[PDB]
Amino acid sequence: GQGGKDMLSNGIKYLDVPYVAHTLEADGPEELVINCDEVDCTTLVEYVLAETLTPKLSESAFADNLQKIRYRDGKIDGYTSRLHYIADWINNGVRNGFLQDVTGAMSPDTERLSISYMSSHPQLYKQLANSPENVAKMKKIEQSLSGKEVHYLPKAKLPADGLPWIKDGDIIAITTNTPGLDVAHMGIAFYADNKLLLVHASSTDKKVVVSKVPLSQMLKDNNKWTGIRVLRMKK
Ligand SMILES: CC(=O)N[C@@H]1[C@@H](O)[C@H](O)[C@@H](CO)O[C@H]1O
Ligand code: NA
Ligand code: NA
Numbered sequence: 001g002q003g004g005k006d007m008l009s010n011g012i013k014y015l016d017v018p019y020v021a022h023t024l025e026a027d028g029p030e031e032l033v034i035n036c037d038e039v040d041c042t043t044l045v046e047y048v049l050a051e052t053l054t055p056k057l058s059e060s061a062f063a064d065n066l067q068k069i070r071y072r073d074g075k076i077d078g079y080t081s082r083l084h085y086i087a088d089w090i091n092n093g094v095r096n097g098f099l100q101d102v103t104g105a106m107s108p109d110t111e112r113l114s115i116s117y118m119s120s121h122p123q124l125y126k127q128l129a130n131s132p133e134n135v136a137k138m139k140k141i142e143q144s145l146s147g148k149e150v151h152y153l154p155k156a157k158l159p160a161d162g163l164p165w166i167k168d169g170d171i172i173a174i175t176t177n178t179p180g181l182d183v184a185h186m187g188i189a190f191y192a193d194n195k196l197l198l199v200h201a202s203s204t205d206k207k208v209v210v211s212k213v214p215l216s217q218m219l220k221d222n223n224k225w226t227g228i229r230v231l232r233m234k235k
């Protein structure tokens with residue numbers, strides 16, 4: 001449908017934008033940061049979704065949509081209000097009416113969430129390493145996310161040519177066997193000559209690209225990547 005076409009075309013607008021890590025991590029209070037010229041895999045998806053959700057004929061409306069995507073119920077309240085874990089990010093979008101969990105309906109396979117990476121490794125995050133308060137807030141979030149079943153598509157069940165229930169513009173969250181982490185990477189689904197490719201911010205290519213191999217191959221090539229969750233904008 002048109003929503004998917006628009007998600008895809010807005011993602012295509014980001015081709016060649018440089019990959020830069022940690023663009024949201026300035027010192028000081030957590031505030032809404034907009035850096036559309038330097039992205040990572042998650043900020044790319046957030047900007048594309050925010051733009052596509054914003055009716056087009058507004059900087060203020062774009063920012064408001066970005067805020068509702070990036071923060072728990074759209075309320076900015078410190079580092080831990082940012083939806084760092086993609087399971088939580090998905091739940092926020094489902095609860096607040098702007099995402100559908102497509103794998104939730106279409107894939108019979110499920111995995112029990114076990115989320116704890118950030119509190120387990122606080123040295124890796126500036127806003128945790130010296131903030132026992134933030135670490136405690138993250139542990140509470142982690143414990144509430146963990147133990148829930150979610151649906152996913154195991155990577156062996158994803159063909160090169162995709163599946164008919166995965167559509168152009170869908171948001172792809174790549175599941176991972178890293179202990180304590182649910183999702184490792186994200187991008188936007190793009191069928192090119194019937195192959196299901198990914199539009200994504202690639203750290204290796206140092207920019208936003210159309211994948212050279214199908215999503216199925218991307219998954220095969222990383223032993224830690226176990227499958228995908230498929231989400232869809234609801235507008
Ligand atoms: C668990 C984790 O590391 N989540 C980070 C999140 O903190 C960050 O806001 C986002 C955009 O940079 O990238 C995610 O990977
Ligand atoms: Na699993
Ligand atoms: Na994991």
Ligand code: NA
Pocket residue numbers: 193194195
């Ligand atoms: Na073909």
